[PDB]
Design a binder for this molecule. Structure first.
Ligand SMILES: N[C@@H](CCC(=O)O)C(=O)O
Ligand SMILES: N[C@@H](CCC(=O)O)C(=O)O
Ligand SMILES: N[C@@H](CCC(=O)O)C(=O)O
Ligand SMILES: N[C@@H](CCC(=O)O)C(=O)O
Lengths: 320, 328, 316, 319
C-alpha cells in the first residue's frame, strides 16, 4: 500500500489503528474504504476555519509538506481545508513545495453532519488522486465534486453550491469518479520544483493589501495601506484592471514610494492585460494577467521576498 | 415609427472615422449622429434623438453622473412621444449604472444599456451589432415592464442580475445567478423569463430631489486581513461598507472586530462575497443580528453598494436595510 | 400543515406506497413540513419511460390537483429523462398548484448521496406560496429550474441539471426557497393541449445529424409510421443534402419535420440557411431535440399543419 | 518571416497572389496578416461544413501531411464552416503526422454582417499558427480569442460568436489581438503519437449515430445495419443508457460484427464503463469523455484497424 499523510488545518470535512491525529482518525472512521487504498498517517497543522488563515500557517504548512515529501516512504500529502481560502493556500503551496509528489487539497461545501454531505466522497476521491501515478508532476491540485483542478487556475466561484469550485480561465485538468482518476490536461506554467521561490528560511511574508474598485472611488484606502506598511497592493480594478482617477493618482504615489502596485480585476475571469488602457510603464505598475486578485496577492507576496523591481515582478506575473 | 432617445455617456461604441453631418437628418448630438452613420439600418426602426449626458470612460463614473442620468431618463420617459431610452455606456461599470436606474426610473417604458467590449475601430468590433440589437429591444412591445436591461452579445440581461464577468471577451456579460431573460439575434427579440423582484415603478426609492448619494466603501477580504481599511473608510465619512467576504460572506477576525465597531457607530455594514456568484446568506457562520450586520443575499459587492447607497437615502436601520436586501 | 402527494416512478432516489414510506424513513424531517401521501405510478428507470406512462402520470396529477385538500404534487423520477416528463407535464397539467420533479444523480446507498437533500428541498418548494403558477419545476442541487428550460447536461455530476438558454428561476438552500425569475412562455392552465381522452401519443422520431449523413433513417422512420421527425441538425439546425432530400420527401407526404440542433444550446432559428417554407419544415427555435419531440407529439394531437405547428413552437 | 499555407474548405470567412482566390480575398480583408507571415493559399473544397464528407477529410489530411513535410512550411491554417469544424479538427488530430501547428478557424457571423467575427478570428489564428509555443499542442481550433484542443472542442450553441467550448476541460490558451498564451495542454496522445494512418485510405468505414429517447425504437438500428454500417454510435440517455427495445437491436448488431459504441445525448461528461450497461456481456464499447460526433470519428478510424471490442475500448480509453 502507498503511504500518505493527511494534514488537517481544521475540523473534520467528513462524518460527525491510530493515524496520529484525532481529526484524521475520525475521517477514517467516517470513510473506512480509504484504508484499503493507502496507509494513512495524520497530523493537525492548525485548528481554524479557512477565513482565519494567515501567512504564518501557510509557511508552517509549506515547510512541513516539504519535509514530508522529502521522506522516501511518503508518496503524497492530502490537506483537508476550509473552502473559503483553499485556492490561496493551494496556490502558495504550488510555488513553494519542492517536489513532484502529489499534493492534494480537499474540503466540503456542506457540513459533515448535513444531509447529502459532500466531504465523504470528496475525501475518498482525493486519496485516489493522491496515489495515482498520473498525478505526479501535475503540481498542487484541488479535488472537489469529482473534479481535479490545477492550483494555478482554481477558485471558489459560488457561495454555497457543492460545485462552487471552478477553473474559469482553463477548466479542470482531470476527473475522479468513484475513485477512478483520469487526467485530460496539465498546466504548462511552471510550478513546484520549477518555481524560483523558497520559503524554508522565511518567518513572515510581506504585507500585500487588496483594494476593490468602483465608481466614485477614493484614495483613502491606498493611503491607509501605505501607512500600515504595505509592501504591495493588488488593485481589483473595473473591467480590464481599470482604476478610478483619484485612486490611480494615489496608486502612482504608492508606486513612486517603492510599494509594488499590481493591477488585477474585480470581474472574475480573464487576463488583466498589459498595453490596454493603463500605461503601466509610465505609472510604475505591474499587470497581473490571468490570475485573480486573491491569487495575485499570493504571487506578489512571494515576489516581494526576492525583489520589488517593476520589471522583474512583471516577468514573474508573465511566467507563473 | 417609434421615437427613441439615445443618451451617450462617452464616445461612440460603434464605427470609427465617421462624420456626424448628413443632409437627410440629425439626431441632436454628434456622438449619436456618428452611431447612425455607422449603423444606418437603425433609422429604419425608429426616429432617433440624441443627447450627450457625460463624456467619460465608465471607470470614471460618479454618483453625480448617475443622478443626472436618472433624472433625465425620468423626464424623457414622462414625455408622451418618447417610447424608450437607450444609453450607450462603457462596459466596466455598466452593471452599476443599470442597477441604479432599475431602482430609480419611474416608468414601465424600456430602458436599455449597451456598450462594446472592442473598440469601434477594431477588426470585428462588437458595437455595431450590439447597438442594432439594443434598438430592436428598446422598441419591442414585450420589453415593456421588464425593468432596465443590458443588451450585449445577442443577449438581454435583467439589470438586477447582470455583471461583467470577464476582462476582455465579447461575451463578458452574464447573469450568473439566473441567466439572460431573453435574446436578440439580428434584431429578432424574444423573451423567455422576467424578474420577479420589484423594479422601476415598484421601487420605493426616489432620487428626484437628491444631489449627492451617501458614501459606501467596498472592502476585499483575504487571509491575514486587516482593520486599517475599515478605519480609513470610517474616518473618510462612510455611511455604509460592503464587505466582499471570503466564501459565503466570511470576514477575517481582526476585520470583523473593526466592522462590529463600525456598525455600533451607526455605519451600515453589509456582507457580500468576493467569490462571484450565489447568495451571501443569513443564518450561516456570521451572527448578523448580534454583530449589527446586513446580509446582501443574491447580489455582488458592486451592486450591493448601489442598493445600500439608495437604502441610506431612507434609513440606516439594520432591520429595514435587511428587508430592502431581501426584497429588491 | 399542507397536504402533498409524492408520486414515485421512481429511479434511485433517497436512503438505502412502500417507496414513499422508505423516503420518509430516510428523510424524516419531511414529515414536519407536510402531510405526505404516496403512490407508485410506475416502477422503472427513466430510460424505460414511454408515452403510456406519461399519459397515466399526467391524468393522475390532474386528478390529484383537482382535489381541494391537495396543495401540490412531487414526482420522484430518474434523471435521464426527467426533462421530457417535466416538459410534457408543463403542457398538460391544468392547474396552478406546484408540480415538482426531483431525482438523484447518485444512488441512495452511495457515499454523499444527493437524494436526501434534493427531496427535502423539493418538498419545501412544493409547499412554498411563491411556487404557485411557476409551472412544472425540476428541483436539483439547490436549484429550481423551469420545465421548459431544464435539461440534463452532464452524464454523472450532481450538478448535471442546467437551463442553458436561461438559467435557474430560483434557489432552495437547506429548505429556504427564493424565486428570482419566472417563465413568460405559457404553461399549465394556459396550455392549449388536453390529454384527458388520449390513450396513445403520436410517433415522433429523432435523428442525429453529421457529415456524410444518410437518407435511410428518415425512410425507416416513415416506414415505421412516424407522424413527426425531429432533426437534431448540425450547428443552427442544418442537414446534410442527402438527408435534407429525404426530409423534404417526408414533409410532402404529410410527416411533420421539425429542425432542432445537436449542439446543446441556442435557438434553431427561422430564416437562417434552411428555407423552411419552401421545403415544408418547422423550426423548433429555443428547445432541444428531446423536448422538441415532446412538443411536436402534443402538437400532432391537434394538427399536422406546418404554419400552426410553427406557431406552437414560437409560442410555448 | 514564417511561411504558412491557408487551406480553404469553402468561401471567405472574412470580408465581402497567394495562389487561391478565396485566400487572396482574405488577405485583402485582413491585410495585417501579411506582416506576420508569407501566406500561400489553396482551395481544398468549396462547401458549407454541413456538406462535409469523409472524402474531403481524407483529401484534407493527406494534403496537410504533405505540406508539413516541406521544410519551408511552418504551419497550416484551415478555414472551415463552424457546424462540423470539431469533427474535421478531431480527425486531423489523429491523422496529421507532424508537430507543426495546424489551426482551424471559422466565423459564426457572415463576413458581410455587422460585427463580423471572421476578421479577428483569422488574424488571431495566424498568430497562433506562427507562435513557437503552438508546436506539439496538436490540432487546435481558434475562435473568439480562445485556443481549444481538437480533442475537447465542440460547437455548443447555434448562433453565438462564443459558441465554441471545451466542456470537459476548457480552452488551452488565449489569443487577444494577436498575443498568444498557453496555460494547459492535452495529455492524450495526438498527431505524431497517433497509431492511425490514412495515407492509403480512400473511403472511411460507415458509422451511424442514433439519438436516444423515451419510447425508442429498433427500426433505426436495423436501417443502419441494412445500409452497411460498420459501427454505430448510440447517443444515449444520461450516462449512455438505451431504451430496452433499442438495446436488444444493438445487441443483435453487435453479435453480427457491427461495433456499438455508447456515447450520450446530454452534452458533457464521460459515458462511463461499469455503470448501468453491462458492456462486456452485451458486446458494446463505452466512449467515455467524448461526444457522439467525435466518437463517430474515432470509431471510423478504429475500424480501419480492427473491429475487436477490447481493442476498440482500449482506443477510446487512450485517445
Ligand atoms: N468558512 C468555512 C466554511 C467551511 C467550508 O466550506 O470549508 C471555511 O472555509 O473554513
Ligand atoms: N473601460 C472603458 C473602455 C470601453 C469599454 O470597455 O466599454 C470603459 O468602461 O468605458
Ligand atoms: N439512469 C437511471 C439512473 C437512476 C436514477 O436517475 O434514479 C434513471 O434514469 O432512472
Ligand atoms: N452552416 C455553415 C455556415 C457557416 C458557419 O457557421 O461557419 C457552415 O458550417 O459552413
Amino acid at each position: 500500500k502507498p503511504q500518505v499523510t493527511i494534514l488537517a488545518t481544521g475540523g473534520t470535512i467528513a462524518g460527525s489503528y491510530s493515524a496520529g491525529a484525532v481529526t484524521v482518525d475520525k475521517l477514517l472512521a467516517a470513510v473506512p474504504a480509504i484504508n484499503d487504498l493507502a496507509t494513512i498517517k495524520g497530523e493537525q497543522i492548525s485548528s481554524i476555519g479557512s477565513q482565519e488563515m494567515t501567512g504564518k500557517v501557510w509557511l508552517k504548512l509549506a515547510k512541513r509538506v516539504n519535509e514530508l515529501l522529502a521522506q522516501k516512504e511518503t508518496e503524497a500529502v492530502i490537506i483537508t481545508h476550509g473552502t473559503d481560502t483553499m485556492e490561496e493556500t493551494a496556490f502558495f503551496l504550488n510555488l513553494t513545495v519542492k517536489s513532484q509528489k502529489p499534493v492534494v487539497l480537499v474540503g466540503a461545501m456542506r457540513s459533515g453532519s448535513s444531509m447529502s454531505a459532500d466531504g465523504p466522497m470528496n475525501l475518498y476521491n482525493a486519496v485516489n488522486v493522491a496515489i495515482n501515478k498520473a498525478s505526479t508532476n501535475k503540481g498542487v491540485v484541488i479535488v472537489m465534486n469529482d473534479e481535479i483542478h490545477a492550483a494555478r487556475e482554481a477558485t471558489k466561484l459560488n457561495t454555497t453550491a457543492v460545485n462552487a469550485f471552478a477553473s474559469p480561465n482553463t477548466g479542470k485538468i482531470g476527473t475522479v469518479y468513484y475513485g477512478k482518476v483520469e487526467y485530460f490536461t496539465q498546466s504548462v506554467r511552471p510550478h513546484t520544483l520549477a518555481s524560483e521561490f523558497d520559503i524554508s528560511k522565511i518567518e513572515e511574508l510581506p504585507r500585500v493589501d487588496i483594494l476593490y474598485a468602483h465608481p466614485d472611488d477614493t484614495d483613502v484606502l491606498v493611503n491607509a495601506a501605505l501607512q500600515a506598511g504595505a509592501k504591495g497592493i493588488i488593485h481589483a480594478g473595473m473591467g480590464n484592471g481599470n482604476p478610478f482617477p483619484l485612486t490611480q493618482n494615489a496608486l502612482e504615489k504608492a508606486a513612486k514610494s517603492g510599494v509594488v502596485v499590481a493591477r488585477s480585476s474585480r470581474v472574475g475571469s480573464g487576463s488583466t492585460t498589459q498595453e490596454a488602457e493603463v500605461d503601466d510603464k509610465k505609472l510604475g505598475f505591474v499587470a497581473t494577467e490571468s490570475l485573480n486578485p486573491q491569487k495575485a496577492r499570493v504571487l506578489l507576496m512571494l515576489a516581494l521576498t526576492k525583489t520589488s523591481d517593476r520589471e522583474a515582478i512583471q516577468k514573474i506575473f508573465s511566467t507563473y
